[PDB]
Symmetry: C5
Subunit: 307 residues, 5 copies
């Protein structure tokens, strides 16, 4: 086989699309293998820039096509390099930018722990014709974390495995196993803005909706509950415009549903309080002392739903 | 004719545009036919990478252009492969990404059952010069369904048919029939988020609008109805920003129209109740006992409109 | 001159941009002319696929450049074909997708009748060197109309005319007239969603704003009118997010302006009713019986503005 | 030097981006110069289509690169033409589409008067090697103005000037002056939709906020003022979604600020009216007769801010 | 080594993406080095336009690839120039447009001071084979500042440094140091629109929420506080649509949180005032005189949070 050493430099990770489960990765890829010796002009190694590699390819130089498995479409290739040492080894350097797909479980959204995966594999050559010797990912771009949306934690996990394709045994007797490189970069979301601007106003609004049982008349309680329901709808429409459009509920979504249920239960209990009188001579006083049990029940509901 | 075996690998299906009735499909396409034998260098088969296939094409190698019938514009072709076995058979491998168009009936939106169709056909060669032998679509990318917007159900349906073009008989005597491959991938929408965040708050809001007949004064009922109508407008504007912009009504749209009609009928009945008095000495009491018939009538309306 | 027969196939029409007055058309274009006879390899006609037409062009084969006059920018050309019959005639087949511009009067928006125009003309050759013999547009893609945003009505109108350019007489003595093909495809908008979700809630909201004169106190009428004005602003912001951003008013826009004027006139008449008393001893009763003339006046205003 | 006559045809002007201060222009550019005579095949002039001009360029034909100075990025070049007359003169025709940048003062937004500028200049050749003889811009596409967002007024102003670059004197002794063509196309915005849907509802809402001093109780005036402030916030959010995102205030922005100040001053004066009583025995009657001076003061403020 | 003088012209800076921490820069880049003398045709220097530089590159002319380090993806290269003087020196001129990445601290958003950085470096050649002699950035495009979103202050700071790569010592003994050019362009945001349309209505709304303690009844104070909370939610949703989507709080965000806390504290103090009575015979008068201490406490909170 042919041994290839891979070095991957990460410049930035951005553009996390939540519905598409994709994200953009910009950086360099370095590939280095060894072939038959050639006589470069002079003792110095010969460097081939962009748009001159194809001349060497047409002349007969061997170079493999290293695609990304999880990239969506084609990467945006910048400058590309091919440096030909006279002892025999060839170094390929290129710059890429593309949308890379992964699973990215977005449940528990403000406190996510999702890793970014770059999968690399030769497009054509199997384990018997092309092996990956080692990969050292240099994700050295680590900076201050308070201005970063994604907190890159730890170091990039690198692994080399063999991938066997079951359909390729129809045309190939024993050589259908491909060498693959997988890169794991674990990241944590910056939770400060969401916690300070979405979770806390939800708590204040839900306590405001708790505050309806301190009124003295049934009519005032009813119109107060309707205005509170309008407030919750307005805040739901406010948070829908900012939060990602993932196809399932997050903590903020369940908190909004909980506030909806709190207002509906408040309406039901105040109506049942008003009409518990036998002939209209009783007062709605015994059951309306749930002002110190409605928030405790809501806190129990929250403690159940968080855990 | 020339026999071509097609293998299609599906990597991901995403980007379902509802107004345009299109969707994105990313994956590989494998084509395999047989020609005259050639002497490859050595006993091993010769592999042609990207941007070297055109040299073989200009030299005289025959390769057909397999377009997608329902793709919109041009697919985003990634790496492409041409592997030339010495016994005679040629394997073409390429990666595509493009927007594929279909019918995609979006009535009954949260509980959709819509299939994704990939239609393939040679661009130039008819049934007498190019036949498709068989297709085996490997849509093996099946994962956990609770984090997927689209639930890919079952297995991909594959069929090979002959398509006859009526206009081509003006220039061709008897050979105007083209071979086509059609692929069906049935999917079901993930209904949990819509059911938990849109259907249930609609029910709570509609029950809140039912709650106006439990008030005691005509004026309070009127201002309560106006605040409720504002709530329904706010929630309609909330759901318009999230739901797709399809050109017809879904279940949520008819539920919003039903809430509009409920509030308008409530206004009409409370006004007619207030002025049913002959000289202002009667009380609005007989007709205002529709507090237990307005929701039953609405439930009958819902049972009629759902079925 | 040289005679060219054109066949245009329409696959889909979509992406109607209202502010830009453009729309996307995807389909095929077929051109067929006749030249000097050539000896194709064998008795069968020779077919030239994509990226091999340029070799024949450089070798000396004549082929004209048929641009679209009203396309914006460049069309997205898919696969292209050139089939060379041995008797002499050449058939050019290509697939296009681009944004085509037209007038598209969007007044009376829900009940529009706007035609989609494709204009075709040789880029270089005039009437004396290139004539269009006939065009038969095959817009055969006609389906069920209840799931289509645009109802394609009738058949495509085809016409061939000569276009004379006045500036080209400065360099050319008598040959400055170009042959042009114009295609008309008339379409009608699907009006069901707009009529059921925008026109009807406007009528319900305007009748609700009519309902303020049935109150009994001046203060209640004032706060009711202010809440109704907030409702109209909310619904205006709701319909602005969905309706197209054309630079002039549609029926919904004039209906919103009419509701604005209704609420303002209601405020003015209730204030003038309250202060028509000489010393505060009169009652606001004679002029407040406009509860059955304010909607009739609004209906007259609507009947005037619709016609 | 070499004389070049330029003819520019404007097809459409659209896509005015206000924050970026750019706009899209689609049309043709014609360039015509004269060189040494050549023997075309036959007496007829030889026409070079697209993708064959580069063959003539490589063979030795001289053609200059005419860039647009104010275009952003690269124009989207459609079909290009090169027609070679046998007497010696060469005509270059090409189609362009790109984003052109200008100043475009967007103060006084509904009644704007902004011109669209296309600047043209050779990329390489100075005044001593390439001169522009004359330009005649054919902006003949003039149509009915009631369906056009931008009213193209008058005729295109054309001027040819010499541009001297001060840095190029470091490498060039006396030849650093470049010939430039500047085109002015003055346009007026269509003000009907903004005036009918934004200015008039602002006036109605501001008169509604004027209407609070006709109430009889301090509490009713306070809650009415708070509901009016909510109405103004809602309308501000309504107009923010539609109006352009220019970095400074327009007439609508100052009108919204004026309404904000009107409601705040109303709150301050009603509170100061309620507590001007010495011991609560006086009535808030002398200062509350500003119902006919608050709108006059606002009209004076408007007359000052408009002029 | 080889000395290269760089001249960079800035045409416009726009498109500041806050979440991506990128921005667009359009302009020219001039590179000038010296090589072996060549015999140009005639005494005049020979100019190579676009799409003819590759012919000289294939023939053997040396030209380096100067990439931008911080550009995202590939720049949109317009026309490119190569002018070959006969004494030996070569001038390379090209036009670029791309998204350049930087840190761009967006804390204290309306009064930002952020610099735009362009980093330039040869793609292949180190300090021993390619040195940058000097750079003179001509950012001469300075205009009136009242219509500019970004106020370009001062002059562009230029610096040339050597960058040493630690990984390249594995293949290179002593030559792993690269020459880099860094350009600083400091800019100040235009703060007038934000200060006049966001900060001032926040102050008016917060003073309106201060105004609740001047009411006379506990119920009126409660419903007034709920309407005020709805107003704050509406204004929060209004400012979320316009302000950038940076992942942390700005001054407007903390002001909105402060208004939320003010309304919640007002609700808590009025409820505690109502129920401080021993048997309902006391009046809520001693603690309700915080009408002149609630705004002073808020002003102290603002003075603490601003500093
Ligand atoms: Na609202
Ligand atoms: Na919105
Ligand atoms: Na929006
Ligand atoms: Na209210």
């Amino acid at each position: 086989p042919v041994d290839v050493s891979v070095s991957i430099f990460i410049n930035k990770i951005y553009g996390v699309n939540t519905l598409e489960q994709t994200y953009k990765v910009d950086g360099y890829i370095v590939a280095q293998w060894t072939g038959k010796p050639r006589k470069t002009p002079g003792d110095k190694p010969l460097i081939v820039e962009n748009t001159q590699i194809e001349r060497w390819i047409n002349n007969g130089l061997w170079v493999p096509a290293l695609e990304f498995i999880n990239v969506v479409g084609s990467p945006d290739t910048g400058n590309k390099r091919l440096m030909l040492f006279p002892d025999g080894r060839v170094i390929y350097n290129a710059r890429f930018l593309g949308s890379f797909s992964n699973d990215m479980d977005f449940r528990l959204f403000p406190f996510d722990r999702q890793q970014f995966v770059l999968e690399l594999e030769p497009f054509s050559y199997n384990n018997q014709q092309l092996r990956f010797s080692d990969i050292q990912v240099y994700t050295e771009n680590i900076d201050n974390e308070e201005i970063d949306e994604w907190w890159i934690r730890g170091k990039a996990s690198t692994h080399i495995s063999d991938i066997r394709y079951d359909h390729l045994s129809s045309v190939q007797p024993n050589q259908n196993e491909f060498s693959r490189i997988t890169v794991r970069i674990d990241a944590v979301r910056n939770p400060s803005y969401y916690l300070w601007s979405f979770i806390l106003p939800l708590g204040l609004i839900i306590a405001a909706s708790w505050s309806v049982f301190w009124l003295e008349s049934f009519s005032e309680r009813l119109q107060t509950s309707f205005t509170l329901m309008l407030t919750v709808v307005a805040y739901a429409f406010y948070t829908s415009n900012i939060l990602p459009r993932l196809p399932y509920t997050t903590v903020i979504d369940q908190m909004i549903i909980a506030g909806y249920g709190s207002i509906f239960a408040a309406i039901l209990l105040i109506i049942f309080a008003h009409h518990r009188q036998a002939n209209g001579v009783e007062d709605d006083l015994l059951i309306q002392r749930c002002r110190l049990a409605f928030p405790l029940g809501f806190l129990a509901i929250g403690c159940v739903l968080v855990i």
